[PDB]
Every structure is written in structure tokens, then in C-alpha cells.
Amino acid sequence: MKIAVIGQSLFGQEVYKELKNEGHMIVGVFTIPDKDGKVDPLAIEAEKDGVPVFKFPRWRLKGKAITEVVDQYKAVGAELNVLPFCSQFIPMEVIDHPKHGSIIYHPSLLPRHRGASAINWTLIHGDKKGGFTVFWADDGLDTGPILLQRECDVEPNDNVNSIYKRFLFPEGVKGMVEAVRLIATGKAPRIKQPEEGATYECIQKKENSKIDWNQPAEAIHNWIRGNDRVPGAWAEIDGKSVSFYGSTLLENDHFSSNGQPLEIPGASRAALVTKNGLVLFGNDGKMLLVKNLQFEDGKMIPGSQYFK
Ligand SMILES: Nc1nc2c(c(=O)[nH]1)N[C@@H](CNc1ccc(C(=O)N[C@@H](CCC(=O)O)C(=O)O)cc1)CN2
């Protein structure tokens, strides 16, 4: 069928490539503008194949569909919209235009963790199960009926990057392909998201990823890994904003005070700079080990090297 891909990044690119190689006609690609001479991988792949590429900075203005970009989108005659990591709300004029409507990839088990940072909040909350959903776009935000859903286990030391690379990206690409295949045969279902279990969390940015030291070690662990690598959990140390990466929960070594003590504004007790990284304490007296640190305008350095 004729497909318009509305999205961005490598995930969008791979979904594009896989749908193309299943024989679908990509009549158009709608991604984000170039940033600093960097072209989105989805736009790069499509232009190569000779597929129309659009880079609208926005779809709506004054809470109303921009008619010119709606007309440019309509022109390619999509029979189905596919939205692999689309960062903006798409007007219903566009969503409802194709014969088959529009499907969206969401990296959480909907209705849980609606929102733009679902993977982060999966880990911040300490969820044991994660996964992705393919759902039909409607007029709300991540509220549309489910087409298919796939689960995976969340590992205790998973960060955003590890669970994305291991499962959410590669199985997500397959999920989108399978969904399009189900639509092509008319078998794709529409399961209304249940009320029970619906949550929504705000997008994670640097501003709201600051660490709260007054939790048990496990909760701090979840916060750090839930924002690793982006946008990076951080806290003030020595009047510097320091970001934390590569947290693992730790039983031993205890203490061992073989490491070098580091005072941290607001922590339950002093951290420890050790051979294997920065040991931090939660208010339960238990430990997590942070392997990598980062200062404002700087490359990552090992936690072991904080003083050096
Ligand atoms: N029709 C329709 N269009 C959609 C979706 C939909 O379900 N229905 N789902 C969208 C994907 N999911 C989200 C969920 C939350 C946000 C979000 O909250 N973005 C912040 C970004 C904040 C920022 O970057 O500064 C905002 O305020 O716009 C964006 C896409 C794709 N477009």
C-alpha cells in the first residue's frame, strides 16, 4: 500500500527501510528540519531512494491546522500514515486523511506511560515489565485504540539506552512492519485503551532531571538510569552541576572507606570516590555505584577520577 512516514531518527529510518523492502510504496516522508547541517537519517535514506521529503517546522499554528502543509501532505496520496517517533501532535485533518488512517509507535505498555518520555518513566518508576505499543492515532495524546502490544523484561540496571537498543528499537521495527501487514489484510484490530492503569508523565528535560537525595538507594538508582543517557540526571557538587551515568545497585564493598569521601549538597551522607566509580548512598544507607560523571561543558570522566 501507499504509505506516508511521519517521524524521525534511526528508528524512523529503519521502519521506512523495512516497509519499502516489504514492497510498500513510500509516497512521502515528513520529518524534522535540518539542525546545524545535520540531516535526519529518515530524510537522508528517502532522498536517496528518490522519495519526496518534507521538513515542516510545524503542522499547526494558533491551535489550527496549517492549510498549506496539510495540502502538501495530502498531495502524496497516502493510504496509510506511519508515525515512527513523531515528536509533534498531528492534526486530525492529516491523521484521518488516508483510507487506513494512521498508526503510531509508542515505547511503553499503553495505557501506562502516555507521553513523550515513556522509556524514561518506565525506568524511573522501577517497572518490572516494559514494552512497546502500536496504536491508532486519535484526537487525544497517546490515547488511541491499540493495534498490537509487545512486552519485555526490565533489567535491574537497564538504562534508557540499554532497553531501547536490546528490545524497544529492534522489536519495535518488527512491530510496525507486522502492524502494516495486518492492516493490508484487513485484520488489524482496534482495542480501546482500558481506563485502569492509564498514566501520563511529562517530557523529561535537563531542568526536571535534578536528583532528589532523600530517597532509598533503589529509587535514586531508578532516577539516574531512567535519565541515562538523555537528558542525564544531575546534582550540584562543589557549586558545579554534575551529571551521573552508569548506575548499578551495590551490596559490597562496604563501606569500605578505602575510597575518598566526597560531600554532596543534600545527600544523607558523604559519597565515596572509589576504584570502580562514585559510590552514592540513599537514605536507607544502601549503595549505588555511578561509573561515569560529566560536568557542564566537558566529556564524561570516570567517577574514580573525580578528584584527579
Ligand atoms: N493526532 C495525534 N498525533 C500524535 C499523537 C497522537 O496521539 N495523536 N501522538 C504523538 C506522539 N506522542 C507524544 C506524546 C507527548 C508529546 C509532548 O508532550 N511533547 C511536548 C514536547 C515538549 C518539548 O519538546 O519542549 C509538547 O509540549 O508538545 C509529544 C508526542 C504523535 N502525534
Residue numbers in the entry: 1 to 308
Text of the article:
The space group of this THF complex was transformed from the P21212 space group of the apo form, containing one zNt-FDH molecule in the asymmetric unit, to P212121 with two molecules in the asymmetric unit. The structure of each monomer in the THF-bound form of zNt-FDH is nearly identical to the apo form, with an r.m.s.d. of 0.65 Å for 308 Cα atoms; the central hole has a solvent-accessible pocket of similar size in the structures of both apo Nt-FDH and the THF complex. The pteridine moiety of THF is recognized by the main-chain carbonyl groups of Gln88, Ile90, Asp138 and Gly140 and the amide group and OD1 atom of Asp142 through direct hydrogen bonds and by the main-chain amide or carbonyl of Asp138, Gly140, Thr143 and Gly144, the OD1 atom of Asp138 and the OG1 atom of Thr143 through water-mediated hydrogen bonds. The hydroxyl O atom of Tyr200 exhibits direct and water-mediated interactions with the O atom of the pABA moiety within each monomer of the dimer, whereas the main-chain atoms of Ala116, Glu201 and Ile203 interact indirectly through water molecules with the O atom of the pABA within a hydrogen-bond distance. In the structure of THF-bound zNt-FDH, the aromatic ring of Tyr200 is observed to rotate by 90° to make space for product binding.
Nt-FDH alone possesses a hydrolase activity, which converts 10-FTHF to THF and formate in the presence of β-mercaptoethanol.
